[PDB]
């Protein structure tokens, strides 16, 4: 029988929007202000979004959110808030995020709240929200500028020292979300905090870790559950500790720059330890990819700009790739580059993926960390999990010159025992009843497939290697006797602040009791027990915590199997297992499967 357990310690900021399921739907101007290397004017703005409005929002692309090219923002309120996107703007952030209500959209911000304009800075009356004692002014140390070393003179940055900082940087977040802004994409952090980019040189006065840390840690409380936090340049020190603690999202690659192939899977395959970590999204999603999931980051691969491909098979790529991965979903092409190709974004099956949660995984192939070992994982084969137990997969070729052959075989690659109806979406065909997925792909071309298990008596199940992982736990396949591909270890105890834990989202018709089976192993020498719980995505307890109790058995290659019984509400629930102070040994984890 199952006994009362206290709550798992986290490590990740486990907010509703990484809950809930992939990243937000958006257009940004970056298609505008990147090849123009200027701040987007406000008339084409209005035009975009007026096109947005008519042809994008109905397909849930319904926010637009600005970019860079700041600097020329220079009017603030009376506590240094900028009051528009531009000063040559005409109408300020309120009269902008009205325009998008009527139209039935919402404005997203780019800005980082560590930014202390010049101008703000020089009048002395401008004083710190709730703060009338501290000046703007009093904000900053003389000369330290953002990108000081490459000329930069518009922007401070801010010292995180000084009274009033906190102040600040928490009433500048919430500015923007009194004004209606659900998502805040937040730049240039790592030139904050080390000063460097290892495309440049010496960038600013760097800031330090701890500054850095602090700073996330007031963004976070402030953004709280109602607005979304995207980290455009993190640093992902120490496996991206910070940014998961404190985040929504994380950029994973280098910027789409002038788009195309090359920068979608070119430039270079090597990790770095800088900012980038890797430099295009098949790497940097496969490589951060044991930090998704529900609960943990949505990794951004930046911006869709469809009309710098060289092929319509080429933008489906685009497409797939972030959908498959659960990325953001954002738009780059404005009205004059979009030409014939809206198309690519409005799938409706291939949004529905994305509607319904879909967080991939590449194939893990071993346990080394992707960064030290590129065969750990595989870049071109993605499968993911719905909560309904239904599964996207998502097949590649990045080969330049052949045509080859992918497969995801769904026993011996995802671990079901059942085989399942497959749609391809593109083709909006069902092939029926397979074991497997398969395409012969052009070069650069993909396929992508909603896979749909039948259900004897209900028998739902998930395996762990598809879903999130969290606190040290992690992949293996270093005993046999699996289903798929592998299973979950690192649920043992360790020296850290965080327990490891793995999180299932499960979608149950009622509400009511539901029979849980755990495949598992466990050569501990003594029976060994996990942390379960069940939430709503807003993280209330629907069940739990409790203790469950998992038999030792003879060998590390000997799997068992089991039984409970848990409480889920109708819809979406979030189960998650994991190993907390007050549980005993270890085990590892193959499999949950739900009786619904
Ligand atoms: O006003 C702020 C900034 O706006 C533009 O830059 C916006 C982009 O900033 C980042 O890109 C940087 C790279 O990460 C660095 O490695 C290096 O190449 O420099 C660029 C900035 O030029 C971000 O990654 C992108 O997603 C943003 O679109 C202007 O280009 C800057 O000059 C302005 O300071
Ligand atoms: O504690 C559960 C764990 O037990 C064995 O691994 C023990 C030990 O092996 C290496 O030294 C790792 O670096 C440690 O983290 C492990 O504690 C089983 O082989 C393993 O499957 C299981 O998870």
Redesign the pocket.
């Known amino acids: 029988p199952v006994t009362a357990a206290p709550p798992l310690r986290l490590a990740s900021r486990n907010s509703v929007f990484t809950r809930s399921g992939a990243g937000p739907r958006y257009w940004n101007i ?1 298609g505008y202000s ?1 090849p123009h ?1 200027a701040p987007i004017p406000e008339n084409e703005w209005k035009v975009n979004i007026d096109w947005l409005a008519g042809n994008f929002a109905d397909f849930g692309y319904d926010i637009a959110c600005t ?5 020329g923002s220079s009017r603030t309120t009376g506590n240094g808030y900028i009051t528009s996107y531009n000063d040559s703007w005409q109408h300020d952030w309120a009269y902008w995020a009205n325009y998008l209500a009527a139209r039935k959209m919402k404005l997203g911000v780019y800005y980082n709240p560590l930014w202390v304009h010049r101008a703000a800075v020089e009048d002395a009356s401008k004083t710190v929200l709730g703060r009338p004692d501290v000046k703007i002014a009093d904000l900053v140390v003389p000369g330290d500028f953002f ?1 000081r070393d490459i000329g ?1 003179n518009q922007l401070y940055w801010l010292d995180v020292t000084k009274s009033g900082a906190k102040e600040y940087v928490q009433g500048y977040v919430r500015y923007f979300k009194d004004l209606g802004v659900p998502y805040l994409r937040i ?2 952090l790592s030139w904050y905090e080390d000063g460097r ?1 290892a ?2 040189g010496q960038v600013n006065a760097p800031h330090g870790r701890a500054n850095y840390e602090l700073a996330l840690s007031w963004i976070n409380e402030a953004a709280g559950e109602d607005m979304e936090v995207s980290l ?2 993190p640093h992902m020190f120490q496996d991206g500790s910070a940014e998961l603690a404190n985040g929504d999202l994380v ?1 994973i690659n ?2 789409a720059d002038k788009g195309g192939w090359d920068r979608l899977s070119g430039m270079r395959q090597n990790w770095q330890d800088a ?1 980038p970590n890797w430099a295009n999204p098949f790497c940097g999603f496969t490589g951060w990819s044991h930090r998704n999931g529900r609960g943990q980051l949505i990794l951004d691969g ?1 911006f869709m700009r469809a009309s710098t491909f060289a092929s319509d098979e080429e933008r489906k790529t685009m497409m797939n790739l972030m959908v498959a991965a659960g990325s953001p979903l954002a738009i780059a092409d404005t009205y004059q580059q979009i030409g014939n190709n809206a198309w690519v974004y409005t799938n409706k099956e291939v949004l529905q993926l994305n509607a319904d949660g879909l967080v991939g995984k590449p194939l893990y192939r071993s346990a080394t960390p992707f960064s030290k070992d590129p065969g750990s994982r595989d870049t071109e084969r993605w499968a993911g999990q719905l909560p309904d137990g239904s599964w996207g997969v998502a097949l590649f070729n990045r080969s330049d010159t052949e045509t080859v052959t992918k497969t995801i075989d769904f026993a011996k690659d995802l671990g079901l025992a059942t085989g399942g109806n497959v749609r391809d979406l593109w083709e909006h065909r069902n092939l029926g009843m397979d074991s497997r997925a398969t395409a012969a792909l052009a070069p650069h071309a993909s396929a992508i497939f909603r896979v749909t298990p039948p259900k004897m008596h209900g028998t739902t199940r998930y395996p762990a290697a598809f879903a999130a992982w969290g606190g040290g736990a992690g992949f293996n396949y270093n005993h046999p006797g699996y289903d798929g591909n592998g299973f979950v270890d690192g649920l043992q105890a360790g020296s850290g602040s965080a327990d490891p834990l793995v999180t299932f989202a499960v979608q149950v018709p009622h509400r009511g009791s539901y029979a849980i089976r755990y495949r598992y192993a466990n050569a501990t020498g003594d029976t060994s027990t996990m942390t379960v719980t069940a939430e709503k995505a807003d993280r209330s307890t629907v069940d739990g915590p409790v203790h469950v109790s998992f038999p030792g058995l003879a060998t590390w290659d000997t799997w068992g199997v089991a039984d409970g019984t848990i409480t889920l509400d109708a819809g979406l629930n979030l189960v998650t297992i994991g190993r907390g102070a007050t549980d005993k040994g270890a085990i590892n984890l193959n499999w949950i499967e739900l009786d619904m």
């Open positions: 970056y990147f290397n970019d860079g090219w700041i600097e990108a930069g730049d240039f980019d495309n440049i455009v340049m950029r280098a910027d900012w930046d």
